[PDB]
Amino acid sequence: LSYRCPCRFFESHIARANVKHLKILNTPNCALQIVARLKNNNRQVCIDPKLKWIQEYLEKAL
Template sequence: MDLKVIAVVTLLMVTMCIHVSHAKPFSLGERCWCRSSENTVPKSSIKQLKFLNTPNCPFQVIATLKNNKEVCINPQTLWLQQYLKNALNK
């Protein structure tokens, strides 16, 4: 009977270790989406824009292109600044 208890405890410990090792560390959840941004994305290739304003990250603009690729756009890009200005005036 002692051997069965040891086997069960060992299995429980192994199971607990497996679940912990696949967990996402907290620090990864707090990282910014955009690590670098592009300055030369033409407006005509953009399908959708997303704006992210998270507490620990600068203002981020994510563009979904017509080929479904996502890229980060520099928020200081002139055409994007004009777009945001027009959107706020409406």
């Protein structure tokens, strides 16, 4: 139904250069909260929360 967590699967190889932004969803019920909107095709995909470059990218935004 409408009750499924929005991220079923995630991508593990997205390049920072290909991200327009990261969206961090306020979904405590769910295991996967990070979404990227991609530059090359304006697609939204869910991202591996262990993706190498994410921690520094978020830190730097603060």
